[PDB]
Amino acid sequence: KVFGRCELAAAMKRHGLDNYRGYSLGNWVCVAKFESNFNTQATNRNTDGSTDYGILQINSRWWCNDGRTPGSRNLCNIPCSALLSSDITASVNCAKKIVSDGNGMNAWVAWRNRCKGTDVQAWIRGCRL
C-alpha cells in the first residue's frame, strides 16, 4: 500500500507516535517519505546482507527475523514480512523500540541526513489531525 501523506500522519498519530520519545509527528512522516516513499512494501538490501523492510525500513540485522541474516537479532520478535503489511501497527510498535534504544531517531540515517534540523511540521501541514 502506498499511503497518502495525511493518511499516514493519521495512522501514525492513532498508533501513538506523535511526540513519542519527544519526536513530533512530522519527524515520523518525513522519515517515512525518504525511507520508503510511503510504500509499505518497500525493501532494500544492505551491504552486510541484512535487509530493511516496510514504510520505516526496519533492519533485519537487529529488529526482525527474515531467516537469511546470519548472526542477527530479532528484538521486535516479528517476522520481517509483518513489516510489509498494509496495516502499519507492527512497523509502529517496532519503531517505538528502536527510537528508545539510546540514539533516538538517529537510528534512521535518513532522518539524521534529511529530516533533523528541518521544518518537519511541514510534513503534517493541512492534515486533519
Contact region with Cl ion (CB under 5 A), list: 26-34, 40-48, 75-83, 111-119: 26-34
30-69 positions binding Na ion, by CB under 5 A: 60, 65, 69
For residue 11 the three cell numbers come to 495512522
C-beta of residue 35 within 8 angstroms of C-beta of residue 108: yes
Task: Considering the complex, state which of residue 71 and residue 117 has its C-beta at the smaller distance from Na ion.
Answer: 71
Number of residues that bind Cl ion (CB under 5 A): 11
Does the footprint of Cl ion cover residue 5 (CB under 5 A)? yes
72, 78, 83, 88 alpha-carbon torsion, rounded to 10° = -140
Catalytic residue annotation: 35, 52
